[PDB]
Structure formats: C-alpha cells, structure tokens
Amino acid sequence: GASAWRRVRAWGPWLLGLSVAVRLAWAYLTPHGADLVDLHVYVSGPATLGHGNLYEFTYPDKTPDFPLPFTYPPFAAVVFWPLHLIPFTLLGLCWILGTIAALYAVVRLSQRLLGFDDARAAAVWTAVTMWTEPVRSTLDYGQINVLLMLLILLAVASSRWWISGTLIGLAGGVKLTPLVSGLYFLGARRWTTAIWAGVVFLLTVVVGIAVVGEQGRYYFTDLLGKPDRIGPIATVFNQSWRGGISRILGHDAGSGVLVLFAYAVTAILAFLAWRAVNDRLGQICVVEMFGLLISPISWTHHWVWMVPFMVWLLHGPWRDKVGAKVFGCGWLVLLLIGVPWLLSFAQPDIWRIDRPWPLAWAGLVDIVAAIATLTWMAVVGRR
C-alpha cells in the first residue's frame, strides 16, 4: 500500500514530535530514566582533571554493583572538560535533545546520500527508529553513538578531503570504535582523506597526552583496550562475535582459535558484501556492520549504524529485490522488539558466562542476523 506510505510520510513532523515528547517525558518522569550513567561518567571524568585520578576514577553512584569507569580516550576527557562547566540537568536535557537531533540529521544525511531529500520521511524514520534497541539504549545511557554516527556520515557526505578527514579523525579520537569507518574510505580509494583522518586521530592522541597526561598514559601498551575493564564480555548485550561465542562457550575464548575462525569468516563475508554494493551509504553501512561484529566490545547501543542500513535497504538502490525488503523488515522487527534486551533478563547476572542451550543460542541472535545479511548480500552480488 503505497497510498498509506504517502499518508504516513505526510504525518512525519507530528509523529517525530510525538516520539520526542514521549521520550522526554519518560526520561524526566521516571526514576533512572534520566540516570545517564555514561553522561555522568563523561561529566565526572574531566571534573577530576588535574588531580591524577581520572582513569583510576570509578562511578558506582548510579550502579553500585558495577562501578562505571572512564574508559574513553584522554582526548574525550579533553573534549568533555567544558561539560564540567555546565549544571548536570542543563547538560542532560541538552544531550537528549542533541541525540534526537543527531538521529534526525543522520537520517536526513542518509536520504541525501541515497539521492533524495525528504524532511517528512526523515521525521517518520527518526520516530520509528527512535525506539530501536540501539537508539533507546544510547538515549537511556547517554552514550555518544548517534553523535559519532552523525559525524561519520557528515564526513562521508562531504567530498572535501579536509572536512571528511577531520570529522573522521576527531570522532575516532573521542571513541576508538568508529575508527573502523575509516576502512570505508580505504575502500572508496580516498587515500588522502584516510591519511588526514589518521593524522587527526594522532593529533587527538597528542592532545590527550598533553592535557590528560601524567594520569592517563600507556593507553595502547599494558592496556590494549582490554575488553574486561570496559565491561562484561559474555553479557548478551555484547553482540559482537566475542560476546556470543562466550555465551555458547561458558568461558571467554577471546583470541582463541574458534573465535579467530569466526573473525576470518565474517571478514570474508563483509568483504563480499561490500563488493556487492556500489553506493556510498551501502558501503559505509556494510563497513560499520562489520565493525560492530569485529570490535571486542559492541554493546547493543553501539549498533546504531543499523538505522542507516535499514534506510539503505528500504530506500537505497536495492528497494525492489525480494531479499532487500525481506531483510529490511527483518531488521526492523528484530531491532524494534529487541531479542538481546529480552534475553538479558534470563541470565543470572551480567557476570555469568555459563548458559544452557536456549539462553546461549538465542544470544547469537544479532550475530546470526548480521551474518545472514552479509551472506545474502555476497551471494546476490556474486550472482
């Protein structure tokens, strides 16, 4: 029914408005709705700046069970030192509004990348995907994942080498996970932009050493970005290969042979999927789908890159293939409902790795969905 599709498109602004009102009401009416454990970490990290206790910092106020640390790169603390100058509520409401606006802007950028501009459809997409498990997880925790997605797609949209390079470098300096997006630029043969993005990431490392130095150092040696310190590896929310393999195993294999084989097979699948795509949005979406699978820690709130992927599926060049619609609706039903969020209740505690067949196998849900999408893209491209 394309008529109903047009009717709902016309009802965009007054559906995104409803979604934003509902989200804002929930956050500031329910206890722990505006808890913002990761925004409070970002605010209390730099708040201790200049006192030699920034990475030894722990934040158990909001989750006594698990003390939230400041695992971000020191450049993130440099960037968040201004947040120390803003009252907590004036920053919480600002951050929620910023994440919402970043979601709308990234949807608009995805539409522009696909070759069409549609403010109403962008509002509808923002409202519908606002409640996808990754987006609601980011909003709940205050984690900056929509903002970095916006920065990365802004870099992709801008053909100018310096703009894209600087955006990618700064965004990757704030968090190391989005650095995998740079690989897309390697695939796009944008060698100069990739070089500049790497240079900016190194200059962000230098800034972090300068400002947050003498307290946060050796961030790559003796630490290796160890997944354990960031958080539990086996918890179902950790939807990377490592999380699901640990669930089905009962013990974190980590760099084990069996995890390495999975890493290699997903590497080949993602490379074939990218080889099966030709448009910027699809290429970046495949690259980030692979990044979410290879990173040692990829919580649900990291999987906000799926939203541009669904936009590509339902509007990109493959808006007619039977498989394209099938997998777009599959991703929508999976994320909107959220299997990992539902399964997280079954496990005794976030630190329990042993699982029976149901709670372990169902823990491979998002991994299996991503691998199925990658294999489908590879086979359809090869054919």
Task: Please give the distance of CA 60 from its chain centroid, rounded to a whole number.
Answer: 24
Name the structure determination technique: cryo-EM
Percentages helix, strand, coil for the chain (3-state, rounded to 5) are 70, 0, 30
Name the strand (E) or helix (H) holding 327: helix 322-337
Instruction: Return left, alpha or beta for 222; rule: phi > 0 is left, psi -120 to 50 is alpha, else beta.
Output: left
The answer to whether the beta carbons of residues 145 and 29 sit under 8 Å apart is no
Q: How far apart are CA 311 and CA 65, in angstroms?
A: 38
The answer to whether the beta carbons of residues 280 and 154 sit under 8 Å apart is no
| Resolution of this entry, Å | 3.5
Closest CA to 296 of 243, 340, 251: 243
Q: What are the phi and psi torsion angles at 362 (to 5°)?
A: -65, -15
**Buried b or exposed e, range 278-306, using 16+ CB within 10 angstroms:** eebbbbbbbbbbbbbbbbbbbbbbbbbbb
**Buried b or exposed e, range 5-32, using 16+ CB within 10 angstroms:** eeebbeebeebbeebbeebbeebeeeee
Name beta bridge partners: 59. 68
Q: How far apart are CA 156 and CA 6, in angstroms?
A: 29
Instruction: Check residue 279 and report its DSSP letter.
Output: S
**How far separated are the first and last CA of the chain, in Å rounded?**
30
Q: How far apart are CA 171 and CA 187, in angstroms?
A: 19
Residue 195's alpha-carbon distances to 200, 271, 290, in angstroms, are 9, 21, 21
**Domain boundaries in the chain?**
231-383
Which positions ≥6 away from 214 have C-beta within 8 Å?
52
The answer to whether the beta carbons of residues 302 and 176 sit under 8 Å apart is no
Q: How far apart are CA 378 and CA 382, in angstroms?
A: 6
Radius of gyration of the chain (CA): 20
Residue 19's alpha-carbon distances to 30, 89, 96, in angstroms, are 16, 21, 13
Q: How far apart are CA 59 and CA 37, in angstroms?
A: 8
Identify residue 269 by its one-letter amino acid code: L
Q: How far apart are CA 252 and CA 95, in angstroms?
A: 35
Helix (H, G, I), strand (E, B) or coil at 59: strand
The answer to whether the beta carbons of residues 119 and 14 sit under 8 Å apart is no
Helix (H, G, I), strand (E, B) or coil at 68: strand
Strand pairing category for 58-59 and 68-69: antiparallel
